[PDB]
Every structure is written in structure tokens, then in C-alpha cells.
Amino acid sequence: MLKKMIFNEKGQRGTESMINGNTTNLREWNRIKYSWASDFYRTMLNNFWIPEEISLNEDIKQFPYLTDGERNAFDKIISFLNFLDSVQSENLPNISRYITAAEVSSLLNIQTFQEEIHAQSYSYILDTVTNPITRDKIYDQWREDEHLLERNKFIAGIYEKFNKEPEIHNFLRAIMANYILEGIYFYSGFSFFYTLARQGKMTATSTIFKYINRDEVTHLVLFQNIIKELKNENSHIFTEELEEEFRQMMRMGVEHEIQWGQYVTNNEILGLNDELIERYIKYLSNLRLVAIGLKPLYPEINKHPMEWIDGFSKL
Amino acid sequence: SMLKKMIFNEKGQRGTESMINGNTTNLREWNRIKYSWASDFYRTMLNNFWIPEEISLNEDIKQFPYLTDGERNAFDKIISFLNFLDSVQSENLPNISRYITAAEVSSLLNIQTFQEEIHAQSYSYILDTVTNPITRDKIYDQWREDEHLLERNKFIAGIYEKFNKEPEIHNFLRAIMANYILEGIYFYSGFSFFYTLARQGKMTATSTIFKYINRDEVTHLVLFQNIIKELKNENSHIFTEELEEEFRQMMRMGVEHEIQWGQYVTNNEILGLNDELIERYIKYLSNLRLVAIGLKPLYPEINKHPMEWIDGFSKL
Ligand SMILES: [Fe+3]
Ligand SMILES: [Fe+3]
Ligand SMILES: [Fe+3]
Ligand SMILES: [Fe+3]
Structure with a gap:
């Protein structure tokens, strides 16, 4: 797979395909292939927020009073x-560098910016609620943690x-990994902060995570739509065995999460236990797989085990 | 012969070691940074956020059909x-950005990239609103159509x-200087056209969009001024007398081209602009740009601002 030119004067007008297309790389939003990129652009700019505009005064007072088990989960x-x-x-x-649809590149560039904002929000949290030595540890x-x-x-x-080795399949699994990260690893983390805020602790950092959650949606x-255009346009490489690879990347990620x-909660967070964590992650993985046209791994888990989260997570 | 950083480097150190070639993890830890100026730049950049579609073009829709042929020729190109x-x-x-080993600088370049996407979209928004699809695509x-362009x-x-295609340190530094020229010269030339139109009462809301872009450009x-300053300090064996002169010449040719x-797009048909005023303005700008990175000006004989009204006009 080779990477795009900076500007390709021999490209044709518009967007031809997601990968391998003959594009100029010019940004021309009224000459796009994928309809849906226009409404995501809009939604993403309207979601803009600045972490430091969210006051943490009450979380400063509560942080010293978290139990050692709650601190253990928070830090890790x-x-x-x-x-x-x-x-x-x-x-x-x-x-983004191998994606040949300029309107999609634009959305990944907006996404990248949003991630930077997320990471910064953690610096703001840690530097405001505790001292520098605890922040650094x-x-x-x-x-210091072999498991992490x-x-x-x-x-x-x-x-x-x-x-290090840009080949199509490697690119393809890389796309799936992103998706797993977005829809499984982060949603687990959110439920920890919502469960402490549900009990009245660290309310304000939970507000920050609802902004992060909104961007994450x-x-x-x-990535859901990116996967389905790629399958529509390259159906010979989306074999029955390639799709099974994705299912198994997902199983393996479920198990890890x-x-x-369970390792960081250690049955010392009130309101979560090992069984509830298990059925929540599995249930989420059922939704994520069907959204990209794949069969679920856990067909017996059809009911939402923590329904209160979806109303709580909204602003 | 530069080398691309890893996605995550488990053997990196805490904090930032250098601009390039440093042993970094790539983790974003804002309270452990080396370039203290990065902090304020993050803040400023975020506070400058704007959405192009939130600025109404209703007055420009009515005025666009009555632009002269000479104004449209300049506007389109x-x-x-x-x-x-x-x-x-x-x-x-x-x-x-992928060769930069200071995460706090990479964060800023990513924000920059996002702002550039907003700029490009602004243009789609202008063209789709003030004229019809066939004119827009033209x-x-x-x-x-235009060989000069x-x-x-x-x-x-x-x-x-x-x-x-050839990741080497000299190609890397020439590219950095190219960027600086692009932003501090090519864009400033374009802004003076839209401000000159708006000063006469034509396409005023298009000019408001360009003030926001101008703000980000600053x-x-x-x-880039600071990135270059740190690269000089940490790589003095590469920044020879001779390479600094090659930067001065890059600016010379950019100035000549701009x-x-x-002159070509205006063709002496835009009121308030003329060939000599354009000559003097671009040269004056290059003196400021070169000074700002510690290099001697190319046109010291042009010392007063030939279009002073622009500075107050461009402000929000
Ligand atoms: Fe994120
Ligand atoms: Fe994300
Ligand atoms: Fe720009
Ligand atoms: Fe710029």
C-alpha cells in the first residue's frame, strides 16, 4: 500500500473510493461521495467544548475522602x-494518510483534535484535585503495574x-482495532465514573466524561460507516474468513476488558461486581457487531444490564 | 535520514527531551512539558474557535451578481x-508532526490541522451560498484552466x-521554512484583496470570514516561529551560515512569486490596489517575517507600512 501524494494534479474531480482512489486531495465539500460525511462534520463542530470551562471545586473537596479501593480504581x-x-x-x-476520500480525511482530522482535547482533560483533572507528586504517580x-x-x-x-508494514489486511485489522477501542474500552471506563457520581462522588469529573462520551458516539x-463503505467497495477481500478474524479480534478484546x-474494581466499588461487569461488556459487544453486519458472540445476552447509564450519560 | 516515531514507545522517558530525535513515549502529559510557551498557545487556539456557517452571507448574496468582470476574475482565482x-x-x-518528538508541540500541530480543515470548508460555504452550483464548480x-495557477x-x-518521499533532515527544515512562508506571505496577500473589496462596501460578510481566518493565521x-527557534538551538551543527542563507533565498523567491x-489577478482593475502598492506591501511583510526568526531583511529600504489601514481593519 502506498501513501498519498501531497497534491495530485493528475487526479480526477471528486471522490472515487475510500482507498486506492484517483483523488487530488482538494477539499471540495459540494463534490463528495459519501453523503453522510456532511452531517457528521456539522455534528462534530457543534459538540465543541473546553475542559477548563467545567468547574471542579466540589471534586477538590471529595478526592481526599475516596476510599483506598476507589482511589485504586480511579488511578489505574x-x-x-x-x-x-x-x-x-x-x-x-x-x-488518514491512505484514505483517498478527502471528506473522510477531514473527519479523521477533526477526530484527532478531539482526542487531544480528551487527553488534556485528564491533565486538568489530575493537576486540580491533587498535588504534583500524586499526579505524577x-x-x-x-x-509500576505489569498488567496495565x-x-x-x-x-x-x-x-x-x-x-511499520502497510499492507491491506494490516490496515484492515487496524481499522477494526480502532472500532473496538472506541466502542468497548472507553464505555467500560465511563461506567466507573458514572457509578461514583451516581453516589454523589466526583460529580464534576463525571460531567467531563459525559462530554467525552458524546464525542465518542x-x-x-x-468507523461504523467507514467499515461498511470499505466492504461495499472491496467485497472480494471481505471474505468469510476475514470477517471471522474481526469477530475474533473482538472476542479477544471483550475478554481483556x-x-x-474486574482487576481494578476488586469488589470494592459499590454498585459494580464481577458478574455485572461481564454482562455489560458482552452486551455492548453484541450491539457493536450487529452495527457492522456481523453475528454477535453472545446470542443469549439480549437485555441491557445497566439501563440507567443511558439516561445518566446524557447532558 | 530521519526516522518516523513509534505509535507508543515503552522505553521512552517522562517529559520532553528535544524537538526531534528525542526519547519520547508520545503520551500526552501536559504538566510535564519542556516548551513552556506551548501551554498558552493551546489556550489561545481553543478560545479562537469559530464555525463558518454561523456567519450570515445574506448581504453578499445580493452583491455578488453586480461585481465587475475584473473583480470576479480576481475573486475566482x-x-x-x-x-x-x-x-x-x-x-x-x-x-x-510525525517526526516531532515533543508531544506538546504535536498537540498544537494537530489543532492547527483541524483549523486548516475549517478554513477550507469556509470556502465551500461561501461559494455554495453566494452563487449557483455551476458557477461554484467553475x-x-x-x-x-489557468496555467499560472x-x-x-x-x-x-x-x-x-x-x-x-525522502525523509532527510535538510528536506525537513526546508519544508518548515516553506510552511512559514506560506502562512506569513501567501495568505496575507490574499487577505488584502477581500479587505480591499469590503472597504468599498462589496462582499463585507466574506471579509468577516477572512478576519477569523486571519486570527487563526497569526x-x-x-x-512556526517558535518551532524554528528551538530547532536552531538544539541542532546548531545543521543550521550553518549557509543554510540560513538558503532560508533567506526561499523567502526571496516566495516574495517574487506572490x-x-x-499583480496578475488584479490586473489594475481593483480600486485601491495597484502594482506598486502590492510590491511594497509584500516586501514589507517579508522584512517582518525574517526579523522574527533572527534573519536579516531582504528589502531594508522599505521601512514604513504602505497600507497601514489594514491592521485596524482586520481586527474583530
Ligand atoms: Fe477520546
Ligand atoms: Fe475516540
Ligand atoms: Fe489556513
Ligand atoms: Fe494556517
């Missing part, structure tokens, strides 16, 4: 989410395979 | 050129593409 989760948002910052540009949790380090190497390793639909959520 | 500029900025910035395609485009894209300028383009 917020450090992991900061890792996710930073590898997205670095890899999204990587993916939360940032460095991966240096190996999640980082695993997730970064999929993206890194395409960074657009990131999910962006479940094992991870 | 300039806005198609500026759309090319922002488009290549949107494509090239991430290529530069303005988009003006580079397919095409060669300019190839020239500008070629500097970036020589790094894109921040992009200062960003004057001849400004």
Missing part, C-alpha cells in the same frame, strides 16, 4: 484512558504492525 | 488558490513532497 483507569487517547492522537493521522501507573503495561503493548502492537458512527475491569 | 493552500496544509502537517476548477500549485506542493505564524501573482 484514568492512566489507561490517557494512554488510549494518546495512541489515537498518534495513529489516526496514520490511517497516576500518570506513571503503567510503569501488557494491555498497552497489546493495543499499541496492532496499530504498530501497520505503521460520533467516533463510533464514523472484562478481566481488566 | 484567489479563492481557488487559497483553497489549494489550506488543502495541502491539511495533508502535509501530519507528515511533519471556481473550484480554476486551476485546471497550476504552476504555482506544483511549485508549492513539490517542496513538501520532496520530504514526503497563531500559526507564532507557532508579487507577480498579485
Whole structure:
């Protein structure tokens, strides 16, 4: 696979295909192929927010009173989410460079900016509610927790395979990895912060995560639609065995997130337990797979186990 | 012979070591940064956020059909050129950014890239609102019709593409200087056209959009000024006497190109602009730009601002 030119004077007008298309790379929003890119552009700019405009005065008073189990989950989760948002910052540009639909490149560039904002919001949280030494030991949790380090190497390793060897399948699994990250790893993290805010603790950082959650919904639909155009335009490489690979990347990611959520809560967070964490992640994976036309892994789990989250998460 | 950074580098150190070639993890940790000026730039950039479609063009819709042939000739060529500029900025910035080893600087370049996408869209919004689809597409395609416009485009894209395909440190620095020129010279020339129209009462809301773009451009300028200053300090063996002179010459040719383009599209038919005033304005700007990165001016004999009214006019 080779990367685009900066400007291709031999390109044709408009957008021809998602990948491998003969494009100029010019931004011409009234000459686009995918209808849907126009309404995502609009929705994404209207969702703009600045983390520092959200006051944390009451969370400053509550942070010293979290139990040691609640602090244990907070530190390891917020450090992991900061890792996710930073590898997205670095890899999204990587993916956009082979995408030949300028209107899609534009949306990934908006997405990249939004990730930077997310990562910054964690710096704002940690620097405001605690002192510098505690802030730095939360940032460095991966240096002292063997389990967290190996999640980082695993997730970064999929993206890194395409960074060093740009082949179609590698690109293709890289796209799926993004999707899994967006729709599974982050939604687990959100439910922790909503469950503490539901009990009255750290209310304001939970507000910040509802803004992050709102952006994440657009990131999910962006990749959902990216996968389906790619299948529509390359149906010979979307074989029965390639689609099974995606299902299995997803199973493997489910398992990791479940094992991870149980490890940092350690039956010391009131309102979550190991069984509820298991059925929530599996249920979410059923929704994510059908949205891209794949059969669910857990056909027996059809009811939402934590229905209160969807009303709570909205602004 | 530069080398691309990893997605995540487990063996990196905490904080930022250098601009390029540093042992970084790529993690975003805003309270552990080396370039303290990065913080304020983040803040400023975010507070400058705007949405092009929120500015009404209702007055420009009625005025567009009564522009002179000479005004339309200039309007069509300039806005198609500026759309090319922002488009290549949107494509090239991430290529530069991926070699930068200071995460706090990479954050800023990503914000820049996002702002460039908004700029390019602004242009779609103007053209789709003030005229009909067939005229709109003709303005988009003006580079397919006008050989001068095409060669300019190839020239500008070629500097970036020589790094894109050959990642070496000299190609990298020449590309950085190219960016600086693009933003501090080519764009400033385009702005003076739309302000000159609006000063006469024509296309006033189009000019309001360009003030927002101008505002963002100032921040992009200062960003590149600081990136260059730090690269000089940390790579002094590469920044020879001779390479600084090659930067001065890059600016010379950019100045020459922009004057001849400004003169070509206006053709002495835009009231309030003339060939000598365009000459003097571009040269005056290059003196400021070169000074700002510690280099001697090319045109020291042009010391007073030849179009002073622009500074107050461009403000919001
Ligand atoms: Fe995010
Ligand atoms: Fe995201
Ligand atoms: Fe711009
Ligand atoms: Fe710019």
C-alpha cells in the first residue's frame, strides 16, 4: 500500500473510493461521495467544548475522602484512558494518510483534535484535585503495574504492525482495532465514573466524561460507516474468513476488558461486581457487531444490564 | 535520514527531551512539558474557535451578481488558490508532526490541522451560498484552466513532497521554512484583496470570514516561529551560515512569486490596489517575517507600512 501524494494534479474531480482512489486531495465539500460525511462534520463542530470551562471545586473537596479501593480504581483507569487517547492522537493521522476520500480525511482530522482535547482533560483533572507528586504517580501507573503495561503493548502492537508494514489486511485489522477501542474500552471506563457520581462522588469529573462520551458516539458512527463503505467497495477481500478474524479480534478484546475491569474494581466499588461487569461488556459487544453486519458472540445476552447509564450519560 | 516515531514507545522517558530525535513515549502529559510557551498557545487556539456557517452571507448574496468582470476574475482565482493552500496544509502537517518528538508541540500541530480543515470548508460555504452550483464548480476548477495557477500549485506542493518521499533532515527544515512562508506571505496577500473589496462596501460578510481566518493565521505564524527557534538551538551543527542563507533565498523567491501573482489577478482593475502598492506591501511583510526568526531583511529600504489601514481593519 502506498501513501498519498501531497497534491495530485493528475487526479480526477471528486471522490472515487475510500482507498486506492484517483483523488487530488482538494477539499471540495459540494463534490463528495459519501453523503453522510456532511452531517457528521456539522455534528462534530457543534459538540465543541473546553475542559477548563467545567468547574471542579466540589471534586477538590471529595478526592481526599475516596476510599483506598476507589482511589485504586480511579488511578489505574484514568492512566489507561490517557494512554488510549494518546495512541489515537498518534495513529489516526496514520490511517488518514491512505484514505483517498478527502471528506473522510477531514473527519479523521477533526477526530484527532478531539482526542487531544480528551487527553488534556485528564491533565486538568489530575493537576486540580491533587498535588504534583500524586499526579505524577497516576500518570506513571503503567510503569509500576505489569498488567496495565501488557494491555498497552497489546493495543499499541496492532496499530504498530501497520505503521511499520502497510499492507491491506494490516490496515484492515487496524481499522477494526480502532472500532473496538472506541466502542468497548472507553464505555467500560465511563461506567466507573458514572457509578461514583451516581453516589454523589466526583460529580464534576463525571460531567467531563459525559462530554467525552458524546464525542465518542460520533467516533463510533464514523468507523461504523467507514467499515461498511470499505466492504461495499472491496467485497472480494471481505471474505468469510476475514470477517471471522474481526469477530475474533473482538472476542479477544471483550475478554481483556472484562478481566481488566474486574482487576481494578476488586469488589470494592459499590454498585459494580464481577458478574455485572461481564454482562455489560458482552452486551455492548453484541450491539457493536450487529452495527457492522456481523453475528454477535453472545446470542443469549439480549437485555441491557445497566439501563440507567443511558439516561445518566446524557447532558 | 530521519526516522518516523513509534505509535507508543515503552522505553521512552517522562517529559520532553528535544524537538526531534528525542526519547519520547508520545503520551500526552501536559504538566510535564519542556516548551513552556506551548501551554498558552493551546489556550489561545481553543478560545479562537469559530464555525463558518454561523456567519450570515445574506448581504453578499445580493452583491455578488453586480461585481465587475475584473473583480470576479480576481475573486475566482484567489479563492481557488487559497483553497489549494489550506488543502495541502491539511495533508502535509501530519507528515511533519510525525517526526516531532515533543508531544506538546504535536498537540498544537494537530489543532492547527483541524483549523486548516475549517478554513477550507469556509470556502465551500461561501461559494455554495453566494452563487449557483455551476458557477461554484467553475471556481473550484480554476486551476485546471489557468496555467499560472497550476504552476504555482506544483511549485508549492513539490517542496513538501520532496520530504514526503525522502525523509532527510535538510528536506525537513526546508519544508518548515516553506510552511512559514506560506502562512506569513501567501495568505496575507490574499487577505488584502477581500479587505480591499469590503472597504468599498462589496462582499463585507466574506471579509468577516477572512478576519477569523486571519486570527487563526497569526497563531500559526507564532507557532512556526517558535518551532524554528528551538530547532536552531538544539541542532546548531545543521543550521550553518549557509543554510540560513538558503532560508533567506526561499523567502526571496516566495516574495517574487506572490508579487507577480498579485499583480496578475488584479490586473489594475481593483480600486485601491495597484502594482506598486502590492510590491511594497509584500516586501514589507517579508522584512517582518525574517526579523522574527533572527534573519536579516531582504528589502531594508522599505521601512514604513504602505497600507497601514489594514491592521485596524482586520481586527474583530
Ligand atoms: Fe477520546
Ligand atoms: Fe475516540
Ligand atoms: Fe489556513
Ligand atoms: Fe494556517
